Amino acid sequence: ADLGHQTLGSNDGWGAYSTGTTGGSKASSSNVYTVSNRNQLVSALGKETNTTPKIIYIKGTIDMNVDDNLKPLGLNDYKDPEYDLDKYLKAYDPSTWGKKEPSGTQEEARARSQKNQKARVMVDIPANTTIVGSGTNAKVVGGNFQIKSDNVIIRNIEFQDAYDYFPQWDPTDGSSGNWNSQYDNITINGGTHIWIDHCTFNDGSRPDSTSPKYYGRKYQHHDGQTDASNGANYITMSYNYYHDHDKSSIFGSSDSKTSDDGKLKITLHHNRYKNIVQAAPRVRFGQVHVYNNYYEGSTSSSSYPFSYAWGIGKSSKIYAQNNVIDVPGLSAAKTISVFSGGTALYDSGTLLNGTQINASAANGLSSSVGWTPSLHGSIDASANVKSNVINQAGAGKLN
Ligand SMILES: O=C(O)[C@H]1O[C@H](O[C@@H]2[C@H](O)[C@@H](O)[C@@H](O)O[C@@H]2C(=O)O)[C@H](O)[C@@H](O)[C@H]1O
Ligand SMILES: [Ca+2]
Ligand SMILES: [Ca+2]
Ligand SMILES: [Ca+2]
């Protein structure tokens, strides 16, 4: 079968559980689409009631920041009449505003501005859908695909620059505050039976090195790359290339969402993470199988310095096998970041800078996560992971 018609293998990660991930493989003739712009994409997807098996081939570059005539939209097109960046900055300067949450005219105007862009860039993917890139140059630019449905395959697409024109200031986010934006490339919001394979995720032509600092903090236009929240379950992400981005993959969005316990069952394998700062992945609650991934970066990089690979969040149950991390000078312990409530990590075969390490033991964590993954394909020796992943991961590697 071609990429449009292929299904997730019956052993290929958590996505293969129960009914598995077949996407729109069973699509009838009238439900196979080829799309090359936002209008065609939105027409093909339809609404949440569009649950018939469907296949969507993406041809070329699809820019999501466009109006109904496909004319590009920017800051001044989305801006609420009452919003002004200068006045926003003046209103919420810690020097005069202090550390209270931004409120009043400018923040309300920014929120409205944000919703205006959201209307264009954010799109829901209905049940029983396969979306695949045709050829080697299929791109989604500025878009945020959201999956709340069951049974969705996304493959062979380069997702670029899910860019928010209206970052929100939060003075309480961290010890010196932070700017936060709303769009990921893909958000799995309660979505189930999902395969994301051979995709590329990056910040396009607007990397964070092109954003200024306000209040001494990066004016952050991006959020996540592939995030999963709100009971998202039975997901395989394989052979993806994540690069040049801050926060990559957050699975479980809140310590308070205890209903995520027993969910967020995600398998990540053969993914490449190059110049990713953090959260690759950051996990709360979930039984997450992380195997044969390759991580490369620098702690001293001027654009996207390495912070950590695995985030051991509250009640996380990461099961890691034969992953390879290449970050000069990094200690075994600092391969991961442990957050309150994170107490356990299974890792075997972890290679740091060519040396076998035990990331869990280096951090005083229990090696018992209470499960062993049965749904997986062949496991590469750590020795071959770097080569295999560099050669095979990302969009434009099949076609
Ligand atoms: O900004 C986000 O997407 C995340 O915010 C929180 O992250 C923390 C900090 O805000 C962030 O700058 C970095 O230091 O990581 C922190 C963390 O991972 O805890 C939330 O905890 C995340 O779920 C996410 O919303
Ligand atoms: Ca944050
Ligand atoms: Ca976020
Ligand atoms: Ca997100």
Domain region containing 222: 1-399
**Quick one: DSSP state of residue 89?**
H
How far, in Å, CA of 138 to CA of 253, rounded? 30
Q: Strands 266-269, 233-238: parallel, antiparallel or unpaired by DSSP? A: parallel
For residue 253, the ligand closest to its alpha carbon is 1
Give the residue, out of 170, 282, 306, with the most ligand 1 atoms within 8 A of its beta carbon, to mutate for a pocket test: 282
Sign of the torsion formed by the C-alpha atoms of 332, 333, 334 and 338: positive
How far, in Å, CA of 269 to CA of 238, rounded? 5
For residues 152 and 21, is the Cβ–Cβ distance under 8 A?
yes
Residue with tokens 């996207």: 304
CATH number at residue 171: 2.160.20.10
For residues 82 and 96, is the Cβ–Cβ distance under 8 A?
no
Cβ 187 under 6 angstroms from ligand 1: no
How far, in Å, CA of 41 to CA of 141, rounded? 13
How far, in Å, CA of 173 to CA of 179, rounded? 8
Cβ 173 under 6 angstroms from ligand 1: yes
Nearest to 174 by CA among 247, 251, 226: 247
How far, in Å, CA of 132 to CA of 315, rounded? 34
Residue with tokens 């860039």: 121
Residue with tokens 């964070």: 208
For residues 165 and 146, is the Cβ–Cβ distance under 8 A?
no
Nearest to 171 by CA among 264, 101, 69, 247: 101
Cβ 176 under 6 angstroms from ligand 1: no
Closest Cα to atom 3 of ligand 1: 223
Cβ 65 under 6 angstroms from ligand 1: no
- The structure tokens listed for 300 are 């001293």
Helix (H, G, I), strand (E, B) or coil at 62: strand
- The structure tokens listed for 141 are 């630019």
Cβ 257 under 6 angstroms from ligand 1: no
Cβ 282 under 6 angstroms from ligand 1: yes
How far, in Å, CA of 163 to CA of 143, rounded? 8
For residues 361 and 302, is the Cβ–Cβ distance under 8 A?
no
How far, in Å, CA of 25 to CA of 37, rounded? 23
Sign of the torsion formed by the C-alpha atoms of 187, 160, 269 and 124: positive
Half-sphere exposure of 352 (CA within 13 A, CB side): 19
The residue type at 166:
F
Closest Cα to atom 22 of ligand 1: 253
Give one DSSP letter per residue of 237-305, joined into a string: EES-EEEEEEE--EES--TT-GGGTT---EEEES-EEEEEEE-TTEESS--EEEES-EEE--TT-SSS-
**At 113, phi and psi to the nearest 5?**
-55, -45
How far, in Å, CA of 238 to CA of 291, rounded? 10
For residue 279, the ligand closest to its alpha carbon is 1
Q: CA torsion 149→254→324→193, rounded to 10°? A: -10
Half-sphere exposure of 202 (CA within 13 A, CB side): 18
Interval between CA 204 and ligand 1 midpoint (Å): 22
CA distances from 309 to 124, 246, 326, 351 (A): 29, 11, 11, 13
For residues 196 and 154, is the Cβ–Cβ distance under 8 A?
yes
Interval between CA 180 and ligand 2 midpoint (Å): 6
Q: Strands 217-218, 213-214: parallel, antiparallel or unpaired by DSSP? A: antiparallel
How far, in Å, CA of 114 to CA of 90, rounded? 19
Cβ 170 under 6 angstroms from ligand 1: no
Nearest to 149 by CA among 252, 45, 289: 45
- The structure tokens listed for 200 are 């590329």
**Quick one: DSSP state of residue 177?**
-
**At 95, phi and psi to the nearest 5?**
-60, -30
Helix (H, G, I), strand (E, B) or coil at 54: strand
Q: Which run of H or of E encompasses 38?
A: helix 38-45
Helix (H, G, I), strand (E, B) or coil at 136: coil
Q: Which run of H or of E encompasses 325?
A: strand 324-326
Closest Cα to atom 25 of ligand 1: 253
How far, in Å, CA of 339 to CA of 37, rounded? 42
Closest Cα to atom 23 of ligand 1: 253
**At 94, phi and psi to the nearest 5?**
-45, -30
How far, in Å, CA of 192 to CA of 195, rounded? 9
Question: Which residues have a Cβ under 8 Å from the Cβ of 387 and sit 6 or more positions away?
Answer: none
Cβ 223 under 6 angstroms from ligand 1: yes
How far, in Å, CA of 382 to CA of 320, rounded? 12
For residues 222 and 182, is the Cβ–Cβ distance under 8 A?
no
How far, in Å, CA of 361 to CA of 172, rounded? 33
For residues 259 and 290, is the Cβ–Cβ distance under 8 A?
no
**Quick one: DSSP state of residue 32?**
E
Cβ 161 under 6 angstroms from ligand 1: no
∠ CA 382-330-395, rounded to 5°: 50
Give one DSSP letter per residue of 128-174, joined into a string: SEEEEESSS--EEES-EEEE-SEEEEEES-EEE----SSPEEETTSS
Cβ 174 under 6 angstroms from ligand 1: yes
Residue with tokens 């200690």: 331
The residue type at 341:
G
Q: Which run of H or of E encompasses 217?
A: strand 217-218
Interval between CA 357 and ligand 4 midpoint (Å): 31
How far, in Å, CA of 379 to CA of 363, rounded? 25
Sign of the torsion formed by the C-alpha atoms of 224, 330, 339 and 373: positive
State which ligand 1 atom lies nearest to the alpha carbon of 252.
23
**Quick one: DSSP state of residue 98?**
T
Q: Which run of H or of E encompasses 385?
A: helix 382-392
Structural domains in the chain (count):
1
For residues 175 and 128, is the Cβ–Cβ distance under 8 A?
no
Interval between CA 193 and ligand 3 midpoint (Å): 22
How far, in Å, CA of 226 to CA of 237, rounded? 9
Give one DSSP letter per residue of 352-381, joined into a string: ETTEE--HHHHTT-BS--S-------PPPP
Cβ 269 under 6 angstroms from ligand 1: no
∠ CA 81-84-90, rounded to 5°: 145
For residues 127 and 152, is the Cβ–Cβ distance under 8 A?
yes
Sign of the torsion formed by the C-alpha atoms of 187, 335, 14 and 1: positive
For residues 271 and 239, is the Cβ–Cβ distance under 8 A?
yes
Give the residue, out of 175, 176, 178, with the most ligand 1 atoms within 8 A of its beta carbon, to mutate for a pocket test: 178
How far, in Å, CA of 330 to CA of 355, rounded? 12
Q: Strands 355-356, 351-352: parallel, antiparallel or unpaired by DSSP? A: antiparallel
Cβ 98 under 6 angstroms from ligand 1: no
Give the chain's count of helices (H) and strands (E).
7, 32
State which ligand 1 atom lies nearest to the alpha carbon of 254.
23
Half-sphere exposure of 214 (CA within 13 A, CB side): 22
Q: How many CB atoms lie within 10 A of CB 37?
A: 16
